[PDB]
């Protein structure tokens, strides 16, 4: 577990917010990996999460509109608990509404998480760095 955090995200967010979160956290002296953790349609969240947790202390999942679009009701209880029911995984809500999160997964909407509409990338990096 060399790195402090690994960031799993949708490709559409990688340059815009993942990129600032990575830069801001590195600026504070934290080790982070974002190259291998982009999510593509057909990827297994479980496998990517286990892969990342084998090389890092914690994991970050960027919950944006793109992440939800890319990712079935029957299995929502299983997949949302992989994002929200893990002690070492912290989700970040990015540019999403409570009703959107609830529409994709009722289970996820009430789980404790960071939110970019409440803090700057710098405030989020400082708060994430404290947990380390």
User: Which positions are annotated as active-site residues?
Assistant: 74
The backbone torsions φ and ψ at residue 30, rounded to the nearest 5 degrees and listed phi first, read -85, 145
Q: Do residues 2 and 33 lie in contact, with contact meaning Cβ atoms separated by under 8 Å?
A: no
Rounded to 5°, the CA angle 96-83-89 comes to: 105
Q: How far apart are CA 38 and CA 59, in angstroms?
A: 13
Count the Cβ atoms, other than its own, within 10 Å of residue 113: 16
Count the Cβ atoms, other than its own, within 10 Å of residue 91: 23
Q: Cβ contacts of residue 40 below 8 Å, gap of 6+? A: 11, 70
Q: Do residues 14 and 66 lie in contact, with contact meaning Cβ atoms separated by under 8 Å?
A: no
B/e letters for 7-30, b = 16+ CB within 10 Å, e = fewer, are bbbbebbbeebbebbbebbeeeeb
Question: Longest C-alpha distance within the chain, in Å?
Answer: 42
Task: Label the pairing between strands 32-33 and 3-10.
Answer: parallel
Q: How far apart are CA 38 and CA 124, in angstroms?
A: 20
Count the Cβ atoms, other than its own, within 10 Å of residue 84: 20
Resolution of the PDB structure in angstroms: 2.6
The structure was resolved experimentally with: X-ray
Domains of the chain, earliest start first: 1-132 (3.40.50.10140)
Q: Do residues 86 and 56 lie in contact, with contact meaning Cβ atoms separated by under 8 Å?
A: no
């Amino acid at each position: 577990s060399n790195a402090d955090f690994f960031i799993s995200h949708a490709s559409e967010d990688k340059e815009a917010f993942v990129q600032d979160l990575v830069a801001a956290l590195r600026d504070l002296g934290a080790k982070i990996f974002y190259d291998a953790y982009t999510l593509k349609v057909g990827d297994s969240l479980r496998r990517k999460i286990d892969q990342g947790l084998a090389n890092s202390k914690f994991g970050i999942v960027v919950l944006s509109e793109h992440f939800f679009s890319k990712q079935a009701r029957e299995l929502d209880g299983l997949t949302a608990m992989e994002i929200g029911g893990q002690t070492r995984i912290l989700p970040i809500w990015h540019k999403v509404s409570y009703d959107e999160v609830r529409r994709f997964s009722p289970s996820l909407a009430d789980k404790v998480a960071l939110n970019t509409s409440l803090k700057s990338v710098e405030e989020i990096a400082k708060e994430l760095h404290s947990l380390i």
